[PDB]
Amino acid sequence: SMSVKKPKRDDSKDLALCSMILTEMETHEDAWPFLLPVNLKLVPGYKKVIKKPMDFSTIREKLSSGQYPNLETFALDVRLVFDNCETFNEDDSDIGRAGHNMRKYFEKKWTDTFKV
Ligand SMILES: Cc1cn(CCn2cnc(-c3cnn(C)c3)c2-c2ccc(C#N)cc2)nn1
């Protein structure tokens, strides 16, 4: 509250660390469904069904240009990529499996980097 601050974590490295995480995700073999926005002319349903599209390149642009106020807003966008993927794709598709794999990969890096 006013004039009563919790000590707070050094956040000076967050930009660099999120960039490194994102780079590791971009170079993962299963990142191919996620590298560019879903093309709304190529994919029947996508536009109407997925209210807030997101993808690695859009995250990279936002990161590179100071559009994430903090760590958590970055993790929300990453999770949005995988949540959209689950909403739109069957678990038993190549894309559905990629999303599950990439989410698991991300959350471990996230916990390893920031919780520990
Ligand atoms: C780009 C692009 C390519 N395509 C057609 C192949 N495709 C069909 N569904 C998807 C999709 C749906 N959800 N997700 C995560 C991917 C894709 C697809 C979309 C983007 C990319 C890339 N980069 C690759 C395949 N659509 N947009």
Side-chain angles (χ1 to χ4, degrees), residues 31-44 46 50 54-55 57 81-82 84-86 88-89 95-96 98-99:
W32 62 268
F34 309 109
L35 300 177
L36 299 173
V38 179
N39 185 326
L40 305 180
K41 304 189 165 155
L42 250 45
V43 188
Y46 209 78
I50 298 297
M54 187 55 52
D55 72 288
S57 76
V81 175
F82 306 132
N84 288 346
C85 183
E86 286 203 49
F88 198 79
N89 302 273
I95 292 164

Side-chain angles (χ1 to χ4, degrees), residues 23-91:
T23 300
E24 291 161 1
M25 282 199 307
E26 292 163 340
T27 60
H28 198 304
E29 169 184 353
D30 295 349
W32 62 268
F34 309 109
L35 300 177
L36 299 173
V38 179
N39 185 326
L40 305 180
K41 304 189 165 155
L42 250 45
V43 188
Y46 209 78
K47 201 180 191 323
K48 180 68 177 278
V49 170
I50 298 297
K51 302 320 195 212
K52 286 162 61 238
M54 187 55 52
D55 72 288
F56 297 171
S57 76
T58 302
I59 299 164
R60 169 71 74 193
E61 187 56 40
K62 292 180 66 166
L63 197 61
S64 277
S65 64
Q67 288 173 66
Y68 291 119
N70 61 50
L71 274 192
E72 302 308 332
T73 56
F74 170 83
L76 289 166
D77 266 0
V78 177
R79 290 171 185 149
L80 179 57
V81 175
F82 306 132
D83 291 345
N84 288 346
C85 183
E86 286 203 49
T87 294
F88 198 79
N89 302 273
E90 284 286 355
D91 292 340

